[PDB]
Amino acid sequence: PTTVLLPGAPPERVVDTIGRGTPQVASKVDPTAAVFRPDPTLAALGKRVFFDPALSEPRGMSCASCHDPGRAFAPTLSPAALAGPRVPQGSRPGHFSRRNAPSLLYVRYVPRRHFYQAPAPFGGLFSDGRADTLAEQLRGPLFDPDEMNNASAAALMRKIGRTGLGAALAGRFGPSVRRDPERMVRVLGEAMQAYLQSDEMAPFSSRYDAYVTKRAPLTPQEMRGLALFRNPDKGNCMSCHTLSDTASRPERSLFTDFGYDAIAVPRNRALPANRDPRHFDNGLCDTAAKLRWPEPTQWCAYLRTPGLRNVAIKESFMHNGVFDTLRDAVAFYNTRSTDPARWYHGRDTFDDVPRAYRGNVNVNSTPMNRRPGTPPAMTDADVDDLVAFLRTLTDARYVGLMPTAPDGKAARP
Ligand code: HEC
Ligand code: HEC
Ligand SMILES: [Cl-]
Ligand SMILES: [Cl-]
């Protein structure tokens, strides 16, 4: 028995099934083994969908409204979003996403959900892995009242069917796209998958990529940061945000293994759902329960480790948008454990994890494993050097959006 976890990759041997059909596999998914066969006409249809502002209610919001091509397909936040929750605003005033949105560059390397050995979960789209594929993912934004707010697949089908996009989809997929709501959603997903898997959506054009391939050097400070990033006794970042500068092949450096961990970033008290003090976004365990994985609450507070390419142009950081500077996101790792009150709004422990799940939080990975009264693993100069290294991961098109002072905030329109 085998399963294919990335497009065109070799089938992987399945050793077991977890819950409703999540495969456990015998070997690590290798991103270099995927094969993305170009499909220019289907990818162009996906791009047409991506930029179509008729696909929201009220009209005016496209996928690009939260995934700006000018910012590595990460959000350029609206004024209300900047002034309030620091996550994307949806199609209406006063409605916002429940989480921050990531860059969609390199998203084609997010594998299907799987376990690999205890065995650990990997893959799935969204930060809680609740969509198995890009085709399934777009059901989220299309029908979420806090995002694009289409009322139903039936309503969206009727709307699209009256437009040129409807004609283009019917031309390619047949006339029933206008009469079968679930077929319409499925073929929107097929088109989108082709666009998001196209080569232009994985450019590998950063200065780090030039250092890996063309041997174009980084600065001494950037090299210090790279060494801290891979130092298990200081940054230890590479243990989750994995990289390999080998074979001059940039795709071995995606800065994530697509696994899950629980680092317990501070509560974003400006997020609407957090007005309820009993509400916590618990991440992966909600997906685990839907998939009937065993003992799903062991995964509460776990979130998918994000890749760090183009991180330095984002306007807010982490799944809840809680940090507004890259340096704060890095500094959090250094003193979360030694100085919890600085990070958790005065509390001595995590303020965005229910008491019931505080034991799920990682307190043994360096640098988050030092009790108060112990010196932190790194100095402030070390943190500065790590930021300098992360800034080398910006694709060439976008370097002007990084703050010119590295401790600052990304450029805003
Ligand atoms: C702002 C209101 C959004 C709009 C409009 C769209 N997306 Fe988005 N997207 C948004 C958020 C807040 C998130 C993360 C949510 C989570 O629970 O983690 C996403 C995520 C995606 C992803 C997954 C990326 C990954 O897991 O690495 C993809 C593939 C994606 N978004 C695509 C997508 C498309 C195709 C959209 C138009 C139909 C679309 N998004 C709109 C917020 C918003
Ligand atoms: C596994 C235990 C991790 C270690 C060690 C490090 N990171 Fe991490 N990182 C991890 C997760 C699960 C998350 C998401 C948490 C959430 O609440 O969303 C992150 C996130 C980041 C970010 C934000 C990226 C963004 O797109 O918002 C950055 C900037 C980042 N991590 C940096 C980073 C550095 C420099 C590390 C060594 C000091 C490091 N991380 C370690 C998981 C893990
Ligand atoms: Cl109908
Ligand atoms: Cl806050």
Residue numbers in the entry: 126 to 242, 248 to 543
From the article:
BthA is the first example of a diheme enzyme carrying out chemistry reminiscent of both canonical bCCPs and MauG. Our efforts reveal that BthA is a peroxidase, capable of both H2O2 turnover when in the presence of an external electron source, yet also generates the bis-Fe(IV) species, as determined by Near-infrared  (NIR) and Mössbauer spectroscopy. Surprisingly, the kinetic parameters of H2O2 turnover indicate BthA is a very good peroxidase despite its spectroscopic and electrochemical parallels to MauG. BthA is also capable of generating the putative bis-Fe(IV) species and produces an electronic absorption spectrum similar to peroxide-treated MauG.
The 6c heme pocket in BthA is more similar to MauG, showing Tyr-His ligation by Tyr463 and His 371. In place of this interheme tryptophan residue, BthA has a serine residue, Ser257. Importantly, both S257A and S257W variants generated the bis-Fe(IV) species based on detection of the 960 nm feature in NIR and yielded nearly identical kinetic values for peroxide turnover. A final trait common to MauG and bCCPs is a catalytically essential Ca2+ ion located between the propionate moieties of the two hemes. However in the BthA structure, the ε-ammonium group of Lys444 occupies the position of the conserved Ca2+ ion, one of the notable differences between BthA and MauG, suggesting that the positively charged Lys side-chain mimics a Ca2+ ion.
